[PDB]
Design a protein around this ligand. Structure first.
Ligand SMILES: O=P(O)(O)OC[C@H]1O[C@](O)(COP(=O)(O)O)[C@@H](O)[C@@H]1O
Length: 319
């Protein structure tokens, strides 16, 4: 499957390019719809027998890249697919930094199927692999990570979604003497920073999308870091109890129990993962698309769990 790595990077490049057309145009859903459409089109020309496992939603409210959709030419291997055609849709609509197009491809059955609900995440890179456990308190995890990283706590840097749900815990960490990078959106890209040496980020902690968590699980596994997650029902996080109760019903069926700590391998089950991400706007991880005349440029991160060549591909496209 390593011959397909380039094909997959083309899938994100094309989703990025299509989402870029809608940058700064104040329309979340048209930008997203364009990226989705372009990603599906590209994936349907790749020689895989793909099943969308993480995607735009159920068949009833997502016509494209719905959960269980078959993609690819059907030649090649049966593979699980996680798509996030635009991570940072609001940012794309507003012309802000950190928008990117995301894809992960793995072995059949490789990715946890969990509902579109919230997940508490704790993520670190290779130097702190094995030092984390979400059953312990945050403070304990943080000291353990700092100690394994070989730095004082006060030097430790934690990134976290800047959201109301997170005020209490951001205070607790600042009080504890930790540097807190609060980001507006995008915990998929931010989790990868834990494994990028020239990023000051050591740790991602906090509650974001469950499907995003499973994509971070896959790439974090590929990069040999570590992650724990914990599914949480809407009302435990924020008539939320209405949607929170179907999430728990969906959990029983799926069949997983919320509130239990997922280890790395509970979410990303093998090392055979190809991860691809292409920047739409510039961010901590990737350069944005530039476009002068009939010539556009993209930067793509391409990671394959079987190895460690981490690839950054700078493409010059003649449209
Ligand atoms: O905004 P919420 O509801 O707190 O969701 C958090 C999730 O949204 C994201 O920030 C993506 O944002 P977008 O929905 O604008 O694409 C993810 O990175 C994160 O997991």
């Amino acid at each position: 499957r390593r011959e397909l790595a380039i094909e997959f990077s083309r899938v994100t490049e094309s989703a990025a390019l299509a989402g870029y057309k809608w940058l700064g145009r104040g329309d979340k859903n048209t930008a997203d719809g364009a990226a989705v459409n372009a990603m599906r089109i590209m994936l349907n020309q790749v020689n895989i027998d793909g099943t969308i496992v993480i995607g735009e939603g159920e068949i009833a409210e997502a016509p494209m890249l719905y959960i269980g959709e078959k993609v690819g030419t059907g030649r090649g291997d049966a593979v699980d697919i996680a798509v996030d055609p635009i991570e940072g849709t609001r940012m794309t609509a507003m012309g802000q930094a950190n928008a990117l197009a995301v894809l992960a491809v793995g072995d059949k059955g490789c990715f946890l199927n969990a509902p579109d609900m919230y997940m508490e995440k704790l993520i670190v890179g290779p130097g702190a692999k094995g030092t984390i456990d979400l059953n312990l308190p945050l403070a304990d995890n943080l000291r353990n990570v700092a100690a394994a990283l070989g730095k004082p706590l006060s030097e430790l840097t934690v990134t976290i979604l800047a959201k109301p749900r997170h005020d209490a815990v951001i205070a607790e960490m600042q009080q504890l003497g930790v540097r807190v990078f609060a980001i507006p959106d995008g915990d998929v890209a931010a989790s990868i920073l834990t494994c990028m040496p020239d990023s000051e980020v050591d740790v991602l902690y906090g509650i974001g999308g469950a499907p995003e968590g499973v994509v971070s699980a896959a790439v974090i596994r590929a990069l040999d870091g570590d992650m724990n997650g914990r599914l949480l029902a809407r009302h435990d996080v924020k008539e939320n109890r209405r949607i929170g109760e179907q999430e728990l019903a969906r959990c029983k069926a799926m069949g997983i129990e919320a509130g239990k700590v997922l280890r790395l391998g509970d979410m990303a089950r093998s090392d055979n993962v190809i991860f691809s991400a292409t920047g739409i706007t510039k961010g901590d991880l990737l350069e944005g698309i530039s476009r002068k005349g009939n010539i556009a440029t993209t930067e793509t991160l391409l990671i394959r769990g079987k190895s460690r060549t981490i690839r950054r591909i700078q493409s010059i496209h003649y449209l």
